[PDB]
Symmetry: C3
Subunit: 148 residues, 3 copies
Amino acid sequence: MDQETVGNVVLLAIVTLISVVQNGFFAHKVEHESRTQNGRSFQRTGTLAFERVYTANQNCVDAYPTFLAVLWSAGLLCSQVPAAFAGLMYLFVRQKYFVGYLGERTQSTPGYIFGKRIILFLFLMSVAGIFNYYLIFFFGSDFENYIA
Amino acid sequence: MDQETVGNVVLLAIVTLISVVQNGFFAHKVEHESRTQNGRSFQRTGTLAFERVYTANQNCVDAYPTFLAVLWSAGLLCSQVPAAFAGLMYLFVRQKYFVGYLGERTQSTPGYIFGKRIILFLFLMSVAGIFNYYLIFFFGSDFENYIAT
Amino acid sequence: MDQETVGNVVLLAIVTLISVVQNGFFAHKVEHESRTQNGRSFQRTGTLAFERVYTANQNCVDAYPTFLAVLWSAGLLCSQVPAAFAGLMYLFVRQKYFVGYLGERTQSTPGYIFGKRIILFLFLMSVAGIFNYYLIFFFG
Ligand SMILES: CC(C)(C)CC(=O)c1c(CC(C)(C)C(=O)O)n(Cc2ccc(I)cc2)c2ccc(OCc3ccc4ccccc4n3)cc12
Ligand SMILES: CC(C)(C)CC(=O)c1c(CC(C)(C)C(=O)O)n(Cc2ccc(I)cc2)c2ccc(OCc3ccc4ccccc4n3)cc12
Ligand SMILES: CC(C)(C)CC(=O)c1c(CC(C)(C)C(=O)O)n(Cc2ccc(I)cc2)c2ccc(OCc3ccc4ccccc4n3)cc12
């Protein structure tokens, strides 16, 4: 990748690598519970600390794709820096969500969803440029300067 | 993103944005179930509609990646319009599947497959340009005006 | 896609197409168990052969995203080949893992963590160029 382009994406790469790392921790806190006992042959059903964890993780796993989607499409189709930061904030809400899904009873982060607004915004940033592009395509050109 | 390039991808972006929205609906019809499922937290096995819902949705979740894969690779390596439409059609089959899952509790429908030929095609388009490239790489530069004596 | 660029990604595309195919196989060996025994909703402890399969598969399904992530970012921020080969190696570990999660009466191979170093490496490749870029940005 030519140093130039690499610039207009760096942040997105960064934030992505971050989520990639955090993504591992989530998948790590799940290994622990699998370990805490019978886990020998990674059984999915140890209850409690394992069920609450696998759930919390298997919830953020279903988000990642759809998140990354907006994350990049928004940052490319328009802005980047804003998209890049929004994506960072997501990483935090994700943390707070995953964490809040710990246990100790009580309706623990019952929500399957979470980011919402964050991806909603990222989606708009994408639906933004996606449209503004269609302009620069018609009225962006046109501008016939028949300088006869 | 230079207005030019943005063009040869717009549809892909569009279709993707679509799937992204629909994707939310899927994860929303799942939130309703855990809600109506009067209880505290959120668990993998509850009730009938919830069980059926989470399954349906958690089936399309395993799809998206492998689908987005071909969607783009097909749209980049071989014509963006045909790729974009394929993915579009795919979004529809998805709807019909997700909807048909648990809505009828009938003996047609279930499965963890959904659109097969839709991604197969997308795959081919990728395996298409991917090969035709090796021609442009190898032969695409071969001309015998060098036999010119 | 201009022939030039297509070059600096073909490997990634290829390997990606592979994992996409293998990805189908995994989801296929899951179809085999489901259709025989019953289950319109596959969320409860299924027949062993089926429970083992869906778990194995629904285990690589959580990987793919985070994998593809490093696969590309590493193959882009850091040169093509190695990143590509890395991902290729991963596809193999995947196979062995998924396969090792098959059997019957065998000590099944757990730790949903599969290919720790593989993606660790790919991650570094990314964190690599990601930094080296900041240099060329300042000290160029
Ligand atoms: C990220 C890294 C730089 C490449 C290092 C890395 O190699 C990975 C690590 C770090 C750790 C402890 C294994 C290590 O390097 O020592 N863990 C555990 C960890 C420990 C502390 C912290 I804070 C965060 C994570 C990983 C866990 C998973 C992983 O990929 C594979 C993988 C497979 C399935 C996944 C499912 C859901 C979701 C993700 C899934 N991922 C790589 C690593
Ligand atoms: C899509 C949008 C334009 C960015 C708006 C948006 O921000 C989200 C919406 C729409 C919303 C909030 C305005 C609403 O519910 O009314 N819902 C609920 C909704 C309502 C109507 C319809 I038709 C479809 C979905 C969302 C649900 C989830 C979401 O992200 C996070 C998320 C987390 C996990 C996911 C797992 C699988 C799959 C996806 C996962 N997503 C964003 C939104
Ligand atoms: C060219 C192509 C990309 C392989 C497309 C394709 O054609 C698909 C195939 C192969 C096929 C059509 C010859 C078949 O046997 O049915 N199968 C079954 C198969 C047969 C032999 C072997 I080895 C491997 C898989 C598919 C199964 C699912 C599929 O949708 C994508 C998909 C769907 C659900 C998934 C769930 C989890 C995780 C990933 C998921 N992915 C496409 C195909």
